[PDB]
Structure formats: C-alpha cells, structure tokens
C-alpha cells in the first residue's frame, strides 16, 4: 500500500526565499511532507524583523519582478495593519502557501509564479504573483478564489497591480475583487 511509504508529490517544485532589508535561498521542495518539514522549522512571518520577506516561487522563477515570467505580470495584494499582524498575517500566509502548493486555482494555477509576504513597520503585505496581467480571466479567477480562501467579506476589496505599473506609475489596480 504505497501511501504508507511514498511521499506525496506536488504538481510543482517550489523554492522558498528569504530577503532582509540580502536574498537567500532557504530550501526547495516538491512534496507535501517536505513542505511541512520546511514550514515547521522556520519563523512565522509575524516573528520576523520589519524589513524581511519570505517568497515562495516556482522553481526556475526568480522572486524578482524583472524575471521574464514576472515582468509582464502582477500581483494580487493583501495589505495588513499592525493589529492584523497579530490576527491575520500567519493564517493568511499559510493559506496562501496552501493555495500555491495545492494548485487551488484550477486551470489557472499555471499562471501563478509565486507569493510574497513583506513584514514592514508601516504595514505588512501578502501577494500572489501571476505571470501575465493581460490574462484577464486567469487573473480574475485567481483573485476570486484567493479572496474566498482568505474568508474576506464581500464588502472588502483587494487589488491586482501589474509589476510594471508599480515600478513606473492613476489607480494602481487593473482588476479588483
């Protein structure tokens, strides 16, 4: 009975990165079991010093917007205040990791590049990065599932911003959900 001894492969191989205010590769993994072993050995995002990021990116995609797979894309952005550092940051980040490794966006999971949590004194950020901001249906589907996965009420609105717009500048958003 193979479930007894075989690890559960992920659809993708993933790389976890750390960045402080230098950019370090922490680990790469491709099974459910190796994901949790990594998750259980590292600091919760809420215990990071302001100025640190974690990034989970598909292997072969650098956690930088200039990467060929990110340059034409953007991000669904969740902004959190200090009160939410306590109540939302860690659960929102885990949920985001789960969405990514579990390929929760159906046929549009292919468009996901990675996710970033920014811990900052002026307001933490979580974001799912996608490959192509002109893929309207893909970005929209990812947005809607992500929002429902985070349990955000209808009243609240999250924006999708292209990396090129963020870098280069009147609304930031090309989609909202």
């Amino acid at each position: 009975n193979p479930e007894h001894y075989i690890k559960h492969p992920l659809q993708n191989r993933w790389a976890l990165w750390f960045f402080k205010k230098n950019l370090r590769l922490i680990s790469k993994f491709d099974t459910v079991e190796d994901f949790w072993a990594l998750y259980n050995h590292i600091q919760l995002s809420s215990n990071l010093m302001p100025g640190c990021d974690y990034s989970l990116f598909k292997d072969g995609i650098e956690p930088m917007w200039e990467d060929e797979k990110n340059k034409r894309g953007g991000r669904w952005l969740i902004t959190l205040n200090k009160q939410q550092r306590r109540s939302d940051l860690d659960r929102f980040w885990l949920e985001t990791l789960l969405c990514l490794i579990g390929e929760s966006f159906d046929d549009y999971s292919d468009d996901v590049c990675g996710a970033v949590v920014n811990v900052r004194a002026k307001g933490d950020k979580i974001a799912i990065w996608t490959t192509e901001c002109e893929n309207r249906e893909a970005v929209t589907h990812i947005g809607r599932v992500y929002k429902e996965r985070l349990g955000l009420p209808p009243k609240i609105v999250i924006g999708y911003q292209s990396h090129a717009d963020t870098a280069t500048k009147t609304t930031k958003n090309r989609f909202v959900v």
């Binding site: 659809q11 789960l98 490794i101 579990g102 929760s104």
Partner: peptide, 12 residues
C-alpha cells in the same frame, strides 16, 4: 496533482 486544504492540513 491538486490537493484540497483539509488533506494538506492533515499532515501539519
């Protein structure tokens, strides 16, 4: 390979 969240959390 798609895994729903409950399955993934069962490993935690």
């Amino acid at each position: 390979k798609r895994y729903d969240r409950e399955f993934l959390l069962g490993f935690q």
